[PDB]
């Protein structure tokens with residue numbers, strides 16, 4: 001019966017199981033330089049039995065930065081450090097995708113180049129908080145800075161920054177990329193009418209609001225290959241940073257139909273904020289499944305039992321676990337053996353060092 005421990009072709013790679021590691025911001029990179037570390041390499045290597053590791057959100061550019069301690073994939077030193085991390089995963093016969101973001105308005109002027117306002121679709125504060133570092137290097141929360149709206153002639157540069165970051169990801173040895181089009185970051189700021197009041201061709205209709213993300217998809221497929229590209233969306237519900245507007249189901253199905261035309265490797269649906277939301281209806285899952293023929297990854301407070309049920313129904317192909325992967329490097333073996341999980345320590349999810357990061361034991 002069990003399908004979680006069977007292989008799955010995911011674009012250009014083949015996962016040996018359906019138990020994926022969700023992208024997890026942990027804010028442990030080196031500053032200055034937003035540089036991945038050998039400790040981050042150890043953490044990912046410990047989890048390399050995952051069917052697929054999806055990395056923490058990683059900046060496409062310095063402007064993309066919104067959190068102190070989040071890594072980039074735009075500088076030589078970042079590329080060199082990520083090469084070591086992907087090599088370590090591959091040494092253990094793993095597969096790893098890099099999640100690429102621009103945080104847009106979920107950012108703060110103090111970590112923007114030049115100390116000026118971050119950018120977005122419109123000049124509306126997100127009215128939330130991001131993460132900085134205090135003078136001792138510890139993670140602190142700070143109110144987001146009001147963004148400025150991207151001028152029309154700046155949008156090709158944003159598309160080019162995603163393209164360049166994917167070129168860099170290929171050099172750095174990643175198996176796949178995941179475009180971060182979820183959770184209220186820049187691509188989702190354009191997608192949502194709540195964060196996008198533009199009157200040019202990047203605002204208004206759903207076609208206009210999806211224009212930027214689809215330009216990015218086309219640019220990165222052209223740069224590398226469609227079967228190397230995944231995308232994460234969170235198109236139903238309210239996320240800390242944004243909501244999906246009054247026609248969220250129709251708009252989501254429009255976007256998914258467009259993504260399918262590009263033949264990309266996978267659609268990763270983040271179904272809920274950590275703070276909760278209404279479950280996806282099975283009717284909606286069927287409409288998604290019939291618009292996207294490729295791999296569908298479900299995430300958001302999943303259990304192994306919920307994953308088996310939906311995989312068995314043919315509605316998703318894999319599950320990404322977030323917090324269970326923080327706490328269980330060998331989550332695959334634990335789920336296969338029905339072993340107990342280590343307890344989670346959420347106080348060390350963000351920032352710090354090895355404690356709460358590489359010190360969760362394997363069986």
Ligand SMILES: Cc1cc2c(cc1C)N(C[C@H](O)[C@H](O)[C@H](O)COP(=O)(O)O)c1[nH]c(=O)[nH]c(=O)c1N2
Nearest residue numbers: 022023024025056057299300301302321322323349
């Ligand atoms: C500490 C931490 C950090 C992040 C996250 C979660 C948490 C707990 N999540 C959301 C994550 O990918 C996953 O969707 C939710 O954690 C899955 O839910 P479970 O944790 O399995 O219940 C997340 N999602 C994302 O697209 N990119 C990221 O960088 C982050 N950062």
